[PDB]
């Protein structure tokens, strides 16, 4: 959550969390997240539950684009950068980072892939650098009219409007197939 640097959306970085106790109450009551939309699990219900592992996929998008991060949602980013499964179970967190990501002159460090031949499968990360081909004639390789770099830069500005203000997004994904990472609670002696 407090990472010094956040990976680009086209290279959204996914981390593994296991063998620990996750206290989601502090996250829920922090109130610092523009976002805590939880699908399949009530946000104030994960303290009694637990899972095999937690998948934390972190990236950065525009504030207006955060909506595209949802199951069964159609959009450029949701289709060619990060697609969630229709039956996704987990929770999406989004919080504004304008002050930590916007600088005078345009912060172009954030990049997002736009053009792709086919829509991405769920949780499919595409790092291909191939030049998108919108014409019958392959270029092999001089970019130009209608032959493409498939990536574009956000160019966040300090004065950019909200829809254009940066937002750091972390998607927590859970799968239940022995329990490893369980939240906060106590044990008792066995009785037969």
């Amino acid at each position, epitope marked *: 959550f407090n990472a010094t640097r956040f990976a680009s959306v086209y290279a959204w970085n996914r981390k593994r969390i296991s063998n620990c106790v996750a206290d989601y109450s502090v996250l829920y009551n922090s*109130a610092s997240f*523009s976002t805590f*939309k*939880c699908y399949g699990v009530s946000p104030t219900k994960l303290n009694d539950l637990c899972f095999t592992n937690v998948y934390a996929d972190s990236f950065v998008i525009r504030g207006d684009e955060v909506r595209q991060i949802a199951p069964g949602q159609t959009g450029k980013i949701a289709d060619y950068n990060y697609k969630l499964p229709d039956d996704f179970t987990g929770c999406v*967190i989004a*919080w504004n980072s304008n*002050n930590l990501d916007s600088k005078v002159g345009g912060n172009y460090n954030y990049l997002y892939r736009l053009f792709r031949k086919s829509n991405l499968k769920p949780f499919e990360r595409d790092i291909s650098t191939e030049i998108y081909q919108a014409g019958s004639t392959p270029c092999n390789g001089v970019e130009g009219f209608n032959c493409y770099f498939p990536l574009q830069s956000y160019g966040f500005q300090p004065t950019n409007g909200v829809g254009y203000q940066p937002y750091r997004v972390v998607v927590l994904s859970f799968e239940l197939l022995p329990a490893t990472v369980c939240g906060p609670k106590k044990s008792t002696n066995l009785v037969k």
Partner: nanobody
Amino acid sequence: QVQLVESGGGSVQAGGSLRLSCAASGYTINTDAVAWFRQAPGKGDERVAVIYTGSGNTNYADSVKGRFTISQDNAKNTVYLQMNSLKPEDTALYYCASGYYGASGYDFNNWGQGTQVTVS
């Protein structure tokens, strides 16, 4: 299909009052819950207040309780935040967000350019 525009900010003395407006356009029927949040440059997002349009229930940040009041005008399709006894801590950009349901902070979206309030 839903737009929210914030207005009514400005510069006031400590202990002054301002009255911030969130005008909504489009088909806002689905969004029952509306919230006001603020962000100073250095700090992160915080929700000052939220209201349930249908029920009328309200929630307030502990700091703002007593000084801030949230109201709505259905004919105007606007949600209003009344700031009394403004304090220097109140200085930040203010925006209004909206969502179908109140469980989480994200489902609120559609917030506009925002309004700047400075207390000095």
